Design an enzyme around this catalytic site. Structure first.
Site, PDB file in Angstrom:
ATOM      1  N   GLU A 217       0.832  -1.209   0.000  1.00 13.40           N
ATOM      2  CA  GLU A 217       0.000   0.000   0.000  1.00 13.40           C
ATOM      3  C   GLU A 217       0.857   1.246   0.000  1.00 13.40           C
ATOM      4  OE1 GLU A 217      -3.275   1.050   3.164  1.00 13.40           O
ATOM      5  OE2 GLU A 217      -1.779   2.660   2.912  1.00 13.40           O
ATOM      6  N   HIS A 218       1.916   1.233   0.775  1.00 21.14           N
ATOM      7  CA  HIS A 218       2.814   2.359   0.810  1.00 21.14           C
ATOM      8  C   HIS A 218       3.531   2.584  -0.514  1.00 21.14           C
ATOM      9  CE1 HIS A 218       3.316   3.677   5.101  1.00 21.14           C
ATOM     10  NE2 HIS A 218       2.380   2.748   5.166  1.00 21.14           N
TER      11      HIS A 218
ATOM     12  N   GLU B 217       4.712   5.104  11.644  1.00 19.14           N
ATOM     13  CA  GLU B 217       3.265   4.887  11.747  1.00 19.14           C
ATOM     14  C   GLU B 217       2.909   3.904  12.863  1.00 19.14           C
ATOM     15  OE1 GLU B 217       2.466   6.100   7.115  1.00 19.14           O
ATOM     16  OE2 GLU B 217       1.956   4.064   7.791  1.00 19.14           O
TER      17      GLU B 217
END
Lengths: 53, 105, 61, 446, 423
Positions: free
Chosen positions: D60-61, D137
């Site tokens: 996703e990153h 994160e």
């Protein structure tokens, strides 16, 4: 003035608790019967005829 | 209106005088028994009435203690007897009754 | 007839506290009798000194 | 003027069509000048190993950081220049990448989505920059007590199963995952029969089809065969994880029984019962007068700062319960009242409250399906979990059928005398002992 | 095959009230009563009155007790929410079609027959403090409240949240006065979604004919300028730099909106570099690590505040602010493309259209338009208005920012945050 508890919801409430109030009474009965050895009531039960006649 | 109403009014006045809260400077509403509806109405009173109500009760409990009573001129006169609590009590009851209706459906 | 066995007991009788109680009370009644007679007979066998003798003296009443 | 019932019939049927791939392409055409296109994928973290965990979160990153036809930042430049918005998410069971854009821009939006979902450039320098970003994160997510407790609850409820894992993975995996690891996970999961191109707004279904054949033709066709596993069931356990930390000022608690999965018809009755219990927060107007007894008793007695019921769904299982936030001396009262409500509903649920539950649920359903974005998401997710798009009229029918008897039967099945999974964090000295929480799951009255 | 739509119906009554309705064949309905009653109408003697009022929507009304409002609305699963800005208050109510009638009634009761009973109002006061604490946990809210206090000497200076010294002090008479003088026909708009025009028009003629309050959109916001600084220690400094721009509705406002997109509003890509954002790239170039920037643009009935907002580590504040300010200067000196303005136009248009995609966004736009303009401007013409904005208009707006007296608010450890003097 107990007209506070008279309506459809309370009527629904009563019914939801009947099988339970009924089964609690069966518990109380057999419980009373078995604890005092209720001759009258017991003599009808198949086994548990430990009073011969 | 006429003879009869005055007769019921004088019977009411008679009971009032016999009841004797007037003798201790109390007002009728100062004698009400405190249940929840009432406890709430007391709460809802405005500052002034609330303060006056405490002074009256205090004045009476004090009198009641030494078993004395107020001079006749200071007795509360019937129908000069402001029923300060009534409107509040009425509304608190009305509110409770609505809750109660909703609780039935 | 084994996994489903305690499963049925729970399903039909232990779920509600209603039945749970009713069953132990119905279960106390039968058990009392079975344990009593069952234990009397064990007390009976290891002995044979008391009222086994009754057959003699009595009857002549 | 049309009735509510009639309005449900007016909603255009969602059009479903399949490519020679396995790629399903579905759309709900409206009249809006804006739209939302996206790709929903049957890839999550419940699919991951242990060493591997964090793989998709990692993809996703990298997903929007460069393709082979569009390098480093070129993609961003295209999306931004047409005023579009590109977003993405990933749960334990689903991954999504969607574009929110003007209707004319549909050709470009699908074309970009295709490029991202197939021709991804996981360039070494970028995958290396992303490890620092993700670790940060993780550090951030640690401060969110709520996110932590739901990860704890999953970790205890689903103990040795893949479902016990978080989406982001453990830090050791973030710093060790290789490009090979990522490429392999992509190969295994990002393939046609496991993806659905979804759209909603001013588009005709044929446009979507054309675009799907034009830009997605080139997946599963010459692919599939051996190496495609299914999902194994995940044992629910029923236990407790308590992370005592008196330094935090409010306790967070999350408790749940095992729910059935997505497929099960009885998620509707559960949602009705949950709605009856509802939610609360200290900024709600209406304290004492709130219908829900939990909410009302919580507000007057100030037993919490917030609480929310939930019904989380996964393949053949789920978590059904509630979560709350409160002062150290209120955890016990809060639990008592929460549990008291579940049993009440299990045994003595009444009719009026069930209509409220159904009503709250009809409003939630429709209020949520407002805008191209939530609907597009709804189409994509549905097809992955239902194989169909379930029209509002059917959900209505399923809701309409729920009466009190159903609630007390369906709540009984899931709640009555069952072991909960309990997760606590913060000042939890007064979190009741597990045996006592377990003894609050049944009642001696009944 | 979607049903052919419907047009929005719009009507000004002779008493000034506006009624707008759209029949989307939706399962749910949305009704909002928009009123020109925001915080700008408060004054020195009654600050916070519109806050307590905003929190008082479910107190008892003639015709509906608090208990009823709550139970009644929840029985059909609907909502009652009040949302405020410095200019308006909006009471929105939501529910399925079949239930519009009861919700409409509660709405009318909340807005036109509130009783504000002494004891219920006393019990609600503590909510101001809970409500305010929750808003104030976002550093932005302090900043923007101080930004406004700093920029204006007047009405727009007022806060959306009750000042601490007033908590517990706002009176039932002050709520009554605020309603009687602001909740009137000429200051109101009844917007409906999923209802029919006759019904809204009937309701408005029967129940919304109230008038005897004040008149226009203000006492007039007098822009003043200045700065408010709040020392904090948050590791991150929040700062906003602004100048007077243009009132909403005017052509210049659109120029400012386009400028906002040339520079940079929010992000479009999850975790992106933000390539098309002028401010962002300009700060990034000389600042290495945690930071954010965005243009800020507030537009009101008789004024406007435009500029930028920055978030950065305590020591980089000066650098971030200075880089940002210089970037605007660059556009003010003429260094603005054509495809840049084009990209900005596309970002602005795509976003507006996106803003009215849903019921909530649409209804709010119709309601606000009714209040500000007394009209309904279709998306086509808004897109047209945006297009009329020329490159020189954008350049001119930038130039207005650069030379106008500034206003600034900042919170955090301000040891390296510049004073305006130093910009």
């Amino acid at each position: 003035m107990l007209t506070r508890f008279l309506g459809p919801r309370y009527r629904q409430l009563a019914r939801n608790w009947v099988p339970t109030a009924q089964l609690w009474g069966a518990v109380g009965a057999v419980g009373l019967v078995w604890a005092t050895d209720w001759r009258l009531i017991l003599d009808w039960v198949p086994y548990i005829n430990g009073k011969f006649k | 209106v006429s003879a009869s109403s005055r007769w019921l009014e004088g019977i009411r006045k008679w009971y009032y005088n016999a009841a004797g809260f007037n003798k201790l400077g109390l007002m009728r509403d100062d004698t009400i028994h405190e249940n929840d509806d009432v406890k709430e109405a007391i709460r809802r009173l405005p500052e002034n009435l609330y303060d006056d109500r405490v002074f009256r009760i205090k004045r009476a409990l004090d009198l009641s203690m030494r078993q004395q009573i107020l001079p006749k001129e200071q007795w509360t006169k019937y129908e000069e007897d402001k029923s300060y609590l009534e409107p509040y009590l009425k509304e608190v009851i009305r509110e409770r009754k609505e809750r109660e209706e909703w609780a039935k459906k | 007839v084994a996994p489903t066995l305690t499963a049925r007991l729970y399903s039909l009788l232990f779920r509600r506290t209603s039945t749970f109680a009713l069953t132990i009370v119905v279960g106390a009644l039968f058990f009392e009798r079975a344990f009593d007679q069952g234990a009397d007979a064990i007390y009976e066998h290891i002995n044979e000194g008391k009222l086994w003798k009754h057959i003699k003296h009595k009857y002549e009443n | 003027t049309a009735t509510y019932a009639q309005a449900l019939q007016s909603v255009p049927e969602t059009q479903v069509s399949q490519l020679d791939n396995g790629l399903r392409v579905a759309s709900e055409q409206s009249s809006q000048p804006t739209c939302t296109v996206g790709v929903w994928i049957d890839a999550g973290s419940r699919y991951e190993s242990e060493k591997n965990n964090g793989a998709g979160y990692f993809v996703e990153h990298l997903a929007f950081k460069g393709t082979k036809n569009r390098p480093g930042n070129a993609l961003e430049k295209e999306v931004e220049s047409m005023g579009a918005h590109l977003n993405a998410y990933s749960t334990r069971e689903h991954t999504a990448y969607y574009i929110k854009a003007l209707s004319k821009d549909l050709p470009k939006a699908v074309e970009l989505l295709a490029d991202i979902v197939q021709n991804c450039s996981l360039e070494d320098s970028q995958i290396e920059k992303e490890r620092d970003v993700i670790l940060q994160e993780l550090q951030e997510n640690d401060t969110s007590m709520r996110d932590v407790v739901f990860n704890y609850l999953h970790a205890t409820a689903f103990q040795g199963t893949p479902l016990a894992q978080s989406v982001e993975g453990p830090s050791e995996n973030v710093r060790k995952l290789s490009r090979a690891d990522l490429t392999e996970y992509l190969s295994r999961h990002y393939k046609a029969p496991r993806m659905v191109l979804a759209a909603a707004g001013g588009l005709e279904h044929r446009q979507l089809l054309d675009l799907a054949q034009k830009h997605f033709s080139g997946l599963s066709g010459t692919y599939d065969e051996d190496a495609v596993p299914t999902l194994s069931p995940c044992r629910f356990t029923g236990s407790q994880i308590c992370h005592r930390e008196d330094g935090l000022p409010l306790a967070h608690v999350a408790i749940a029984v095992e729910g059935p999965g997505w497929a099960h018809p009885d998620n509707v009755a559960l949602q009705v019962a949950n709605a009856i219990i509802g939610h609360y927060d200290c900024t709600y107007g209406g304290g004492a007068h709130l219908s829900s007894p939990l909410a009302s008793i919580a507000a007057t007695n100030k037993l919490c700062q917030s609480f929310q019921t939930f019904n989380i769904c996964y393949a053949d299982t789920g978590l059904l319960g509630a979560h709350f936030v409160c002062d150290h001396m209120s955890i016990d009262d809060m639990m008592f009242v929460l549990q008291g409500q579940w049993m009440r509903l299990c045994t003595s649920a009444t009719e009026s409250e069930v209509l409220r539950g159904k009503n709250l649920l009809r409003n939630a359903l429709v209020s949520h399906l407002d805008g191209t974005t939530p609907v597009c998401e709804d189409i994509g997710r549905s097809l992955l979990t239902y194989g169909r798009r379930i029209p509002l009229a059917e959900w209505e029918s399923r809701i309409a059928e729920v009466d009190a008897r159903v609630v007390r039967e369906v709540c009984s099945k899931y709640f009555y005398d069952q072991c909960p999974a309990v997760a606590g964090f913060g000042p939890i000295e007064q979190l009741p002992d597990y045996n006592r929480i377990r003894s609050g799951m049944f009642w001696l009255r009944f | 095959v979607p049903p052919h739509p419907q047009d929005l119906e719009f009507t000004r009554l002779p008493n000034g009230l506006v009624i707008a309705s759209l029949e989307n064949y939706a399962p749910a309905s949305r009704i909002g009563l928009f009123i020109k009653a925001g915080s700008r109408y408060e004054n020195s003697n009654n600050l916070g009155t519109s806050h307590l009022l905003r929190l008082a929507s479910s107190l008892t009304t003639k015709g509906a007790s608090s208990f009823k409002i709550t139970r009644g609305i929840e029985a059909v699963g609907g909502k009652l929410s009040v949302t405020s800005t410095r200019e308006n208050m909006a009471y929105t109510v939501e529910c399925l079609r079949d239930d519009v009638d009861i919700l409409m009634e509660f709405l009318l009761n909340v807005t036109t027959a509130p009783e504000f009973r002494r004891w219920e109002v006393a019990a609600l006061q503590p909510q101001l403090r809970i409500d305010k604490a929750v808003a104030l946990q976002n550093p932005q809210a302090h900043v923007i409240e101080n930004l406004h206090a700093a920029a204006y000497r007047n009405a727009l200076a007022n806060s959306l949240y009750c000042p601490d010294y007033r908590i517990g002090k706002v009176t039932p008479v002050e709520l009554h006065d605020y309603v009687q003088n602001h909740f009137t026909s000429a200051r109101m708009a009844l917007i409906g979604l999923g209802v029919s025009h006759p019904v809204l028009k009937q309701v408005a003629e029967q129940f919304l004919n109230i008038r005897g309050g004040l008149g226009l959109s203000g006492a007039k916001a007098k822009y003043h300028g200045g700065e408010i600084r709040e020392q904090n220690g948050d590791s991150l400094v929040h700062a906003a730099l602004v100048a007077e721009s243009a009132a909403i509705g005017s052509a210049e406002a659109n120029a400012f909106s386009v400028l906002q997109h040339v520079l940079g509003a929010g992000p479009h890509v999850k975790r992106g570099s933000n390539a098309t954002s002028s401010l962002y790239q300009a700060v990034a170039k000389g600042v290495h690590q945690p930071f954010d920037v965005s243009a800020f643009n507030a537009s009101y009935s008789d004024s406007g505040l435009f500029g930028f907002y920055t978030i950065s580590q305590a020591a980089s504040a000066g650098d971030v602010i200075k880089a940002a300010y210089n970037q605007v200067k660059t556009i003010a000196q003429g260094n603005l493309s054509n495809p840049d303005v084009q990209a900005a136009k596309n970002k602005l248009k795509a976003g507006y259209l996106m803003s009215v995609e849903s019921s909530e966004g649409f209804l709010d736009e119709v309601g606000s338009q009714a209040l500000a303009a007394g009209s309904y401007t279709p998306p086509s013409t808004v897109l047209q208005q945006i297009d009329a904005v020329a490159d020189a208009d954008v350049i001119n707006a930038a130039k207005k920012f650069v030379s106008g007296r500034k206003s600034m608010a900042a919170s955090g450890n301000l040891g390296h945050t510049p004073f305006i003097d130093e910009l």
